[PDB]
């Protein structure tokens, strides 16, 4: 408590201090304006961030194809009102669509006795379909109907005169669309003359109702220029085909197949579906399904899947099953023909328990698509590698930047790092930690060096590295 007093201090207040205080008091207002001018000069020196591309509802997730309602649930529960017991399962896949099969009336190849304006009674009714749409909007899942009128015969477009196939469609594109359906589907347009003007008069009216509607057109071609003859005017149509379904079995082919397809059309939005309406167990052999799920969930576009592709629903591994619509194996009792034929590795609940299964990989990947920003609408750049490896980087402007490298070859490859295709913003760091691998041999979340990457045959990687500041 050794201080000076008050009255002892005011005598000791010297004129040498009143200059010392007023100079130091002025230093604060200089040091504060020297920190306010330094902040506004760095809020404009800092680089801005890019605007959002203002996506629609089909830019997320993966559209789900459902061909035959009777083969989906099975016998007895094959009605359309029994589908609401499955929307609790489709939202477990986080699937943002539902391509529904043709539910209209045609007997067999009859041009006169058909109508796309009412529902056939073998599945439900009008009051049954609107009961389905109460739960579709309830769980954030949109539905799409298949408009193929002759979906029983070989020629799916009524090989007589072409007037009646264009006048009742425009009734169905208005009457069903007033009910609240979210888009329309039409397929097999190789059996359709002047179809590019047939779709354009349907694409104009589908977006003419609301902007968030869309049309899914499907050929069965594999030609680069045949589909550009269809996409020459409709640059907002989601065109599926069989373009990626060639023989191939080399890494440099599909690398050249998807770089040339994008670069010819630019960077527009596409649909990375492998087929028109068929399953992945007919164009692939056995141990390649676990690799294409990584490949179709990372290319820029909306992947389109049919029912059963998340588990490996095969028709060649079971005789006595129709190719047009095989049944869906929910349990051991879903296939009641032969007891003990199906086993624990082709069922729903068995695959939903094994974390290294195929249905576990489809649920692990779609969550990394419907929540990201780099895989949603990022940028696609490929690497000019050596042997049959497909690798590419995906990046938005300042979010976490995703990397994918996968081995199409049947031998053990090396890393083979190839930069200098990318700008200086997107460079490869030394360290990048894993997030998901197809063949489980490592620990998730264990980082490793890029130049010491040794890949096993028929496996893929999903690597994440942050914005390297």
């Amino acid at each position: 408590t050794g201080l000076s007093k008050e009255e002892l201090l005011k005598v000791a207040g010297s004129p040498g201090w009143v200059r010392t205080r007023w100079a130091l008091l002025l230093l604060f207002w200089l040091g504060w304006l020297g920190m306010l001018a330094g902040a506004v000069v760095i809020i404009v020196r800092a680089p801005r961030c890019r605007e959002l591309p203002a996506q629609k509802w089909w830019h997320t997730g993966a559209l789900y194809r459902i061909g035959d309602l009777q083969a989906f649930q099975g016998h007895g529960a094959g009605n359309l009102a029994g589908l609401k017991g499955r929307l609790d399962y489709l939202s477990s896949l986080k699937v943002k669509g539902l391509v529904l099969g043709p539910i209209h009336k045609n007997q067999k190849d009859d041009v006169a006795q058909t109508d796309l304006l009412q529902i056939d009674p073998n599945f439900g009714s009008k009051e049954d379909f609107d009961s389905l749409l109460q739960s579709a909007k309830k769980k954030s899942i949109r539905v799409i109907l298949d408009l193929t009128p002759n979906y029983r015969g070989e020629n799916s477009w009524f090989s007589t005169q072409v007037d009646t196939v264009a006048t009742k469609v425009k009734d169905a594109l208005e009457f069903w669309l007033q009910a609240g359906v979210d888009g329309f589907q039409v397929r097999d347009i190789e059996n359709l003359k002047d179809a590019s003007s047939f779709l354009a008069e349907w694409q104009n009216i589908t977006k003419g109702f609301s902007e968030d509607r869309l049309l899914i057109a499907g050929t069965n071609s594999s030609d680069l220029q045949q589909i550009l003859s269809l996409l020459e005017s409709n640059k907002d149509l989601l065109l599926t085909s069989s373009y990626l379904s060639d023989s191939g079995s080399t890494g440099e082919h599909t690398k050249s197949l998807v770089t040339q397809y994008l670069n010819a059309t630019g960077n527009r939005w596409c649909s990375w579906s492998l087929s028109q309406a068929r399953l992945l167990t007919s164009f692939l052999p056995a141990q390649l399904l676990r690799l294409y799920q990584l490949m179709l969930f990372t290319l820029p576009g909306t992947p389109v899947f049919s029912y059963g592709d998340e588990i490996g629903l095969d028709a060649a591994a079971l005789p006595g099953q129709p190719m047009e619509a095989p049944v869906m194996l929910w349990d051991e009792s879903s296939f009641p023909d032969i007891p003990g034929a199906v086993s624990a590795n082709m069922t729903v609940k068995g695959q939903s328990e094994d974390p290294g299964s195929l249905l576990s990989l489809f649920r692990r990947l779609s969550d990394q698509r419907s929540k990201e920003r780099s895989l949603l609408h990022g940028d696609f750049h490929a690497f000019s590698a050596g042997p049959g490896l497909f690798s590419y980087i995906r990046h938005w402007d300042q979010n976490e930047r995703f990397l994918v490298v996968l081995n199409f070859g049947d031998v053990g490859l090396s890393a083979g790092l190839q930069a200098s295709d990318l700008p200086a913003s997107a460079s490869l760091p030394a360290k990048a930690d894993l997030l998901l691998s197809t063949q489980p041999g490592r620990e998730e979340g264990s980082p490793l060096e890029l130049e010491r990457l040794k890949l096993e045959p028929h496996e893929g990687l999903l690597l994440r590295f942050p914005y390297a500041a």
Partner: protein, 457 residues
């Protein structure tokens, strides 16, 4: 009266803790069903803690706060550490967090989808600080006429969230993340992360460890005070638990763990007249938490320089416009030293860990006072069922927050070990060489020349 003494407990527990806690109690709780239990439990576990501090504060009718209560129960060592931590850590980082949530609520309307320039953040907390110091170092009448407009800023922000959540439940849905259809617990937590939600959900409940003994000496409600804190703190949990409801009826929890400023993304996803109402009236609320927590520190320097310590260079008064000029500069320098961190949610965990280190000791001092030295005349006596459930809630909240990240909680037990050499040479030392004492005499007197301050009478 009763309501106006209930209104100055609700009216100051409410602060700028609700604008950065839902980003932190949602990530560490995994899901949103567990992130509303933590907002309910810590409201209930604090009315245990506020019922207990009323009991110790009525049998020891002293002034100063928790520093006055450890000295009369524990020794001179453990009493000094409460003054020594609350002048070094818990005050310089209860205004280094409420200064860093001012920069993030003014850059986020300009940098929506890109995380902001990191070295331009700290130059917006060293302007909110250095302007509010000079205002608090001027006349004391200035430090209250603008404080009650930073209640008007805070109340307009919180009344607008409390109303726009009523509309979204009447125009939109009913309880969208409920355990019937939605709300899967997809990232289920365990031992470590479910206890780190009670260390960021207890930052918005600061303001009762001293802020109840300043109530009885204005109108003297005569022992209605434990009946005045049964209707106050559930009126501040119901405001807090309905604001976090009003966020998830307007955005997704993939986005609530993405954005740095929580109330400004809720403000822009509802209304067309934006960016002059929501990021304005929250940057006006975190001014009244960096102003109200500077002149709160002045009544700790005064009561700390009485008994044995906190020497007479501090606790002085400007001869006109009486404000403690050499005392406010001790926090304003030590806050700017605590702005070198590269985050904010690692400073909420640093405060809340040692804030619970003294919420357990000064409640365990009751149990010692209830066992040793009983039979004191006591006006209000509470059950023993209450301070035993706090001692177990304090038990698993420290041994689980030390097994996870033992670095930000590992130096909170290393500051308080520096005070044991400090309480070896303050009042425990012989003045034989007489050399070190006269330098303490020296810088004290020249500070009376640098600023004109004197001692009180």
């Amino acid at each position: 009266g009763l309501v106006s003494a209930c209104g100055i407990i609700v009216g100051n527990i409410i602060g700028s803790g609700i604008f950065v806690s839902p980003k932190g109690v949602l990530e560490n709780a995994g899901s949103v069903g567990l992130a509303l239990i933590v907002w309910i439990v810590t409201g209930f576990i604090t009315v245990v803690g506020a019922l207990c501090y009323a009991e110790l504060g009525v049998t020891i009718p002293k002034s100063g706060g928790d520093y006055s209560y450890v000295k009369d129960i524990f020794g001179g060592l453990a009493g000094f550490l409460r003054l020594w931590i609350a002048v070094l850590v818990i005050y310089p980082t209860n205004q280094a967090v409420i200064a860093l949530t001012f920069s993030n609520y003014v850059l986020q309307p300009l940098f929506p989808t890109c995380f902001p320039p990191e070295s331009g953040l700290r130059l917006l907390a060293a302007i909110c600080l250095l302007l509010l110091t000079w205002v608090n170092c001027s006349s004391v009448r200035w430090a209250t006429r603008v404080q009650d407009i930073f209640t008007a800023g805070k109340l307009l922000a919180l009344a607008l969230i409390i109303i726009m959540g009523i509309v979204q439940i009447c125009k939109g849905e009913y309880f969208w993340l409920e355990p019937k259809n939605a709300f899967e617990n997809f990232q289920e937590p365990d031992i470590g992360l479910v206890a780190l939600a009670f260390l960021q959900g207890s930052f918005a409940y600061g303001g009762w460890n001293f802020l109840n003994y300043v109530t009885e000496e204005l109108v003297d409600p005569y022992k209605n005070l434990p009946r005045a804190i049964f209707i106050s703190i559930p009126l501040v949990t119901f405001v807090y638990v309905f604001a976090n409801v009003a966020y998830v009826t307007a955005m997704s929890p993939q986005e609530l763990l993405a954005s740095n400023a929580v109330a400004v993304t809720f403000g822009e996803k509802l209304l067309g007249v934006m960016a002059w109402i929501m990021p304005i009236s929250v940057a006006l609320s975190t001014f009244g938490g960096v102003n109200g927590s500077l002149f709160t520190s002045s009544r700790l320097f005064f009561a700390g320089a009485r008994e044995g310590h906190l020497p007479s260079v501090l606790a002085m008064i400007h001869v006109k416009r009486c404000t403690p000029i050499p005392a406010l500069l001790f926090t304003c320098i030590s806050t700017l030293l605590m702005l070198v961190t590269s985050d904010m949610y690692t400073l909420i965990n640093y405060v809340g860990f040692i804030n619970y280190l003294f919420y357990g000791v000064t409640v365990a001092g009751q149990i010692v006072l209830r066992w040793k030295k009983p039979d004191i005349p006591r006006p209000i006596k509470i059950n023993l069922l209450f301070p035993i459930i706090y001692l177990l809630f304090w038990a698993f909240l420290l041994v689980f927050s030390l097994w996870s990240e033992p670095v930000v909680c590992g130096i909170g037990l290393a500051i308080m070990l520096t005070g044991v050499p400090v309480y070896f040479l303050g009042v425990y030392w012989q003045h034989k060489p007489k050399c070190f004492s006269d330098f303490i005499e020296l810088l004290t007197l020249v500070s009376q020349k640098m600023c004109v301050v004197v001692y009180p009478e």
